[PDB]
Write an enzyme that holds these catalytic residues in place. Structure first.
Site, PDB file in Angstrom:
ATOM      1  N   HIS A 205       0.973  -1.127   0.037  1.00 35.14           N
ATOM      2  CA  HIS A 205       0.224   0.049   0.082  1.00 35.14           C
ATOM      3  C   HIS A 205       0.923   1.255   0.158  1.00 35.14           C
ATOM      4  O   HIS A 205       1.495   1.631   0.984  1.00 35.14           O
ATOM      5  CB  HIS A 205      -1.098   0.030   1.236  1.00 35.14           C
ATOM      6  CG  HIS A 205      -1.935   1.242   1.104  1.00 35.14           C
ATOM      7  ND1 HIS A 205      -3.068   1.014   0.370  1.00 35.14           N
ATOM      8  CD2 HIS A 205      -1.723   2.389   1.606  1.00 35.14           C
ATOM      9  CE1 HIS A 205      -3.596   2.315   0.603  1.00 35.14           C
ATOM     10  NE2 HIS A 205      -2.944   2.962   1.176  1.00 35.14           N
ATOM     11  N   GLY A 206       1.112   1.851  -1.155  1.00 34.71           N
ATOM     12  CA  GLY A 206       1.948   2.994  -1.493  1.00 34.71           C
ATOM     13  C   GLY A 206       1.189   4.289  -1.118  1.00 34.71           C
ATOM     14  O   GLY A 206      -0.011   4.393  -1.884  1.00 34.71           O
ATOM     15  N   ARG A 221      -8.230   3.528   5.833  1.00 37.03           N
ATOM     16  CA  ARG A 221      -9.623   3.883   5.992  1.00 37.03           C
ATOM     17  C   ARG A 221     -10.335   3.769   4.639  1.00 37.03           C
ATOM     18  O   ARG A 221      -9.718   4.148   3.558  1.00 37.03           O
ATOM     19  CB  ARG A 221      -9.815   5.189   6.608  1.00 37.03           C
ATOM     20  CG  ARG A 221      -9.382   5.294   8.081  1.00 37.03           C
ATOM     21  CD  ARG A 221      -8.728   6.843   8.323  1.00 37.03           C
ATOM     22  NE  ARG A 221      -7.308   6.787   7.499  1.00 37.03           N
ATOM     23  CZ  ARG A 221      -6.866   7.972   7.183  1.00 37.03           C
ATOM     24  NH1 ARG A 221      -7.337   9.181   7.611  1.00 37.03           N
ATOM     25  NH2 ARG A 221      -5.621   7.982   6.877  1.00 37.03           N
ATOM     26  N   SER A 243       2.452  -0.347  -6.383  1.00 32.92           N
ATOM     27  CA  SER A 243       2.283   0.622  -5.274  1.00 32.92           C
ATOM     28  C   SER A 243       3.309   1.699  -5.117  1.00 32.92           C
ATOM     29  O   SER A 243       2.969   2.983  -4.416  1.00 32.92           O
ATOM     30  CB  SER A 243       2.295  -0.238  -3.839  1.00 32.92           C
ATOM     31  OG  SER A 243       1.224  -1.065  -3.739  1.00 32.92           O
ATOM     32  N   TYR A 246       2.590   5.313  -6.387  1.00 26.00           N
ATOM     33  CA  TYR A 246       1.850   6.586  -5.539  1.00 26.00           C
ATOM     34  C   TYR A 246       2.504   7.069  -4.611  1.00 26.00           C
ATOM     35  O   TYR A 246       2.279   7.905  -3.730  1.00 26.00           O
ATOM     36  CB  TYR A 246       0.860   5.480  -4.804  1.00 26.00           C
ATOM     37  CG  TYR A 246      -0.473   4.932  -5.848  1.00 26.00           C
ATOM     38  CD1 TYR A 246      -1.201   5.820  -6.608  1.00 26.00           C
ATOM     39  CD2 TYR A 246      -0.006   3.719  -6.564  1.00 26.00           C
ATOM     40  CE1 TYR A 246      -1.921   5.358  -7.529  1.00 26.00           C
ATOM     41  CE2 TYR A 246      -0.950   3.155  -7.519  1.00 26.00           C
ATOM     42  CZ  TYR A 246      -1.878   3.942  -7.969  1.00 26.00           C
ATOM     43  OH  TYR A 246      -2.613   3.682  -8.977  1.00 26.00           O
ATOM     44  N   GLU A 335      -4.950  -5.291  -8.474  1.00 24.49           N
ATOM     45  CA  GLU A 335      -5.519  -4.436  -7.445  1.00 24.49           C
ATOM     46  C   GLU A 335      -6.395  -5.331  -6.493  1.00 24.49           C
ATOM     47  O   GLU A 335      -7.383  -5.756  -6.846  1.00 24.49           O
ATOM     48  CB  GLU A 335      -6.227  -3.361  -8.106  1.00 24.49           C
ATOM     49  CG  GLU A 335      -5.296  -2.373  -9.024  1.00 24.49           C
ATOM     50  CD  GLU A 335      -6.046  -1.040  -9.591  1.00 24.49           C
ATOM     51  OE1 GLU A 335      -7.035  -0.721  -8.787  1.00 24.49           O
ATOM     52  OE2 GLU A 335      -5.480  -0.583 -10.459  1.00 24.49           O
TER      53      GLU A 335
HETATM   54  C1  LIG Z   1      -7.076   9.376  -2.161  1.00 23.67           C
HETATM   55  C2  LIG Z   1      -5.649   9.385  -2.477  1.00 23.67           C
HETATM   56  C3  LIG Z   1      -4.916   8.847  -1.522  1.00 23.67           C
HETATM   57  C4  LIG Z   1      -5.325   9.360  -0.065  1.00 23.67           C
HETATM   58  O1  LIG Z   1      -4.394   8.483   0.958  1.00 23.67           O
HETATM   59  N1  LIG Z   1      -4.610   7.482  -1.736  1.00 23.67           N
HETATM   60  C5  LIG Z   1      -3.627   6.908  -1.976  1.00 23.67           C
HETATM   61  O2  LIG Z   1      -2.445   7.410  -1.978  1.00 23.67           O
HETATM   62  C6  LIG Z   1      -3.598   5.304  -2.013  1.00 23.67           C
HETATM   63  C7  LIG Z   1      -3.013   5.103  -3.427  1.00 23.67           C
HETATM   64  C8  LIG Z   1      -2.904   3.744  -3.807  1.00 23.67           C
HETATM   65  N2  LIG Z   1      -3.714   3.348  -4.700  1.00 23.67           N
HETATM   66  C9  LIG Z   1      -3.655   2.106  -5.179  1.00 23.67           C
HETATM   67  C10 LIG Z   1      -4.534   1.756  -6.191  1.00 23.67           C
HETATM   68  C11 LIG Z   1      -4.289   0.082  -6.951  1.00 23.67           C
HETATM   69  C12 LIG Z   1      -3.465  -0.560  -6.349  1.00 23.67           C
HETATM   70  C13 LIG Z   1      -2.359  -0.059  -5.137  1.00 23.67           C
HETATM   71  C14 LIG Z   1      -2.642   1.208  -4.763  1.00 23.67           C
HETATM   72  C15 LIG Z   1      -1.689   1.651  -3.846  1.00 23.67           C
HETATM   73  O3  LIG Z   1      -0.595   1.088  -3.130  1.00 23.67           O
HETATM   74  N3  LIG Z   1      -1.770   2.965  -3.478  1.00 23.67           N
END
Ligand SMILES: CC[C@@H](CO)NC(=O)CCc1nc2ccccc2c(=O)[nH]1
Length: 353
Positions: A205-206, A221, A243, A246, A335
């Site tokens: 989870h990046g 969350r 991941s 991000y 995903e």
């Molecule tokens: C709503 C943007 C932000 C708030 O924390 N969210 C992120 O940075 C999570 C992003 C994220 N998205 C993914 C989508 C597909 C697969 C893996 C990931 C992941 O590791 N991080």
């Protein structure tokens, strides 16, 4: 004058706490999201402003779905609430579902920036108490999350390292600096209820650096207004490279610094999809997770297992290999989605250069 108590933290934990609570890092993130930091200082950021921001975005969403205001009229009200800086030129209209979700994603990050600011407020007890902890110990204590630095000799160290190297960029190799075991207190009980629910997997989870304190404080969350390709759940990847995309990586000295989470995810009965579905709010009945299957997957024949709190947790250890069944999937990489916060437990935090 109040006595400043000595810092109890190891140098790597001090550096991490310095990084994820840094005022310049938070402003940098706002600058990178084209926000006007002068019109919106860190200390002025508020919950009321963010709420007003999401209200303006919802009005734009209704217009995008009558004789009501134009998309440019409704965009202009959003920019009045959330000041942007495009070299002091006219900000652009939010006239597409792609622009809208991007603006929502920007505010979700901004909400986690405001949460880190709110978390640092000086309580009345602190004002009365005649000594203070070192500022890094105080910030660490506010997370209400145990962090334990691992040495090369910890049983999971080589497993995590192999997971990172085999599923990360083959040329743009992320360099592992440190691993912390994460024990978020108040997250154990909700996750333990799913003990009978198996199919546990350690997944990436990046995020950007500006949301790491909020995640260590509150866990992963399912936020209102959140979404994406597989709907309103928590997004994970089995491939580090997916991941890592991000992780912005902040510049420091002659190198880049970034943080990556490893979460333990109880996937239970999996429902596989091979096409995007932004409307998903849960898995289909009788299913505990939705897995958007990619053209590739870390060699399943190379999977290992870790014992975490007397439960077997699958940890991928192989490089990505093709998946003929999903050769025509709309997803290049997998995903993994859960739609209940309790199906995830944070387990590790990695510093990468
Ligand atoms: C709503 C943007 C932000 C708030 O924390 N969210 C992120 O940075 C999570 C992003 C994220 N998205 C993914 C989508 C597909 C697969 C893996 C990931 C992941 O590791 N991080």
């Amino acid at each position: 004058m109040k006595r400043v108590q000595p810092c109890s933290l190891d140098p790597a934990t001090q550096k991490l706490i310095t990084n994820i609570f840094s005022k310049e890092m938070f402003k940098n993130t706002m600058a990178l999201m084209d926000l006007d930091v002068k019109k919106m200082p860190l200390g002025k950021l508020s919950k009321q402003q963010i709420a007003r921001g999401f209200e303006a975005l919802e009005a734009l969403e209704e217009a995008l779905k009558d004789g009501g205001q134009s998309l440019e009229e409704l965009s202009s009200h959003f920019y009045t609430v959330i000041p942007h800086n495009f070299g002091h030129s006219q900000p652009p209209p939010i006239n597409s579902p792609e622009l809208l979700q991007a603006k929502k994603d920007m505010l979700l990050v901004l909400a986690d920036i405001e949460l880190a600011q709110a978390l640092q407020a000086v309580s009345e007890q602190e004002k009365t108490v005649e000594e203070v902890p070192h500022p890094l110990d105080r910030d660490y204590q506010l997370l209400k999350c145990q962090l334990q630095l691992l040495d090369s000799g910890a049983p999971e160290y080589k497993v995590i390292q192999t997971y990172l190297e085999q599923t990360g960029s083959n040329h743009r190799c992320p360099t592992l600096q440190h691993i912390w075991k994460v024990n978020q207190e108040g997250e154990e009980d909700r996750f333990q209820a799913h003990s009978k629910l198996g199919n546990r997997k350690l997944l990436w989870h990046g995020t950007n650096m500006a949301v790491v304190a909020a995640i260590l404080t509150s866990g992963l969350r399912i936020m209102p207004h959140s979404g994406g390709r597989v709907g309103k759940g928590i997004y994970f990847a089995s491939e580090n490279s997916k991941s890592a995309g991000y992780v912005i990586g902040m510049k420091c000295g002659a190198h880049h610094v970034g943080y990556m989470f490893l979460g333990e995810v109880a996937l239970g009965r999996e429902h596989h999809i091979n096409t995007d579905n932004p409307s998903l709010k849960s898995p289909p009945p009788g299913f505990d997770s939705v897995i958007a299957r990619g053209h590739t997957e870390p060699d399943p024949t190379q999977d290992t297992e870790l014992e975490l709190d007397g439960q077997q947790v699958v940890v991928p250890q192989g490089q990505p290999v093709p998946c003929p069944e999903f050769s025509s999937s709309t997803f290049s990489q997998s995903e993994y989605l859960i739609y209940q916060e309790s199906q995830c437990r944070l387990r590790y935090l990695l510093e990468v250069h």
